[PDB]
Amino acid sequence: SMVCEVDPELTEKLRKFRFRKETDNAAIIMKVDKDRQMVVLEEEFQNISPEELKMELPERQPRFVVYSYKYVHDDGRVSYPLCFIFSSPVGCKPEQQMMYAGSKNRLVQTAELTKVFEIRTTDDLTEAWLQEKLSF
Numbered sequence: 001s002m003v004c005e006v007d008p009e010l011t012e013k014l015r016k017f018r019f020r021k022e023t024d025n026a027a028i029i030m031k032v033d034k035d036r037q038m039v040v041l042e043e044e045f046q047n048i049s050p051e052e053l054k055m056e057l058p059e060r061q062p063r064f065v066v067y068s069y070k071y072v073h074d075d076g077r078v079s080y081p082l083c084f085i086f087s088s089p090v091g092c093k094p095e096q097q098m099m100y101a102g103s104k105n106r107l108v109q110t111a112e113l114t115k116v117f118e119i120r121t122t123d124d125l126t127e128a129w130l131q132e133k134l135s136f
Helices: 008-017 050-056 094-111 127-134
Strands: 027-033 038-045 063-068 082-087 116-119
Touching: 008 027, 008 038, 008 063, 008 094, 027 050, 027 094, 038 050, 038 094, 050 127, 063 094, 082 094, 082 127
Parallel strands: 082 116
Antiparallel strands: 027 038, 027 063, 063 082
């Protein structure tokens, strides 16, 4: 049994996030607790830029993220798409990545987000990258 359970309190938070009316760029960063075999909250930010988010993530361990991004378009229109990001850095321990890989689908299906992105370096997480990924 490698697949982790999801903390019930974290499940409530993710469920609330799906349809949130708040406009601030909130991020929920989640990790595996290897001992509990449980995906848990690590930290949550009320309002964080893609660069700031990039800076929080560990460079050499995996994390799951849900993120709200305020997207101001060329023409002034504003949208707030949400996405799920699996930070799976090349260089993480294979056993570590594997544990995260095995719980990703469960957590995605719990968050119920359809925009699911995987980055193999935290360098990739930029405003330009998000805008490309989020536009359709």
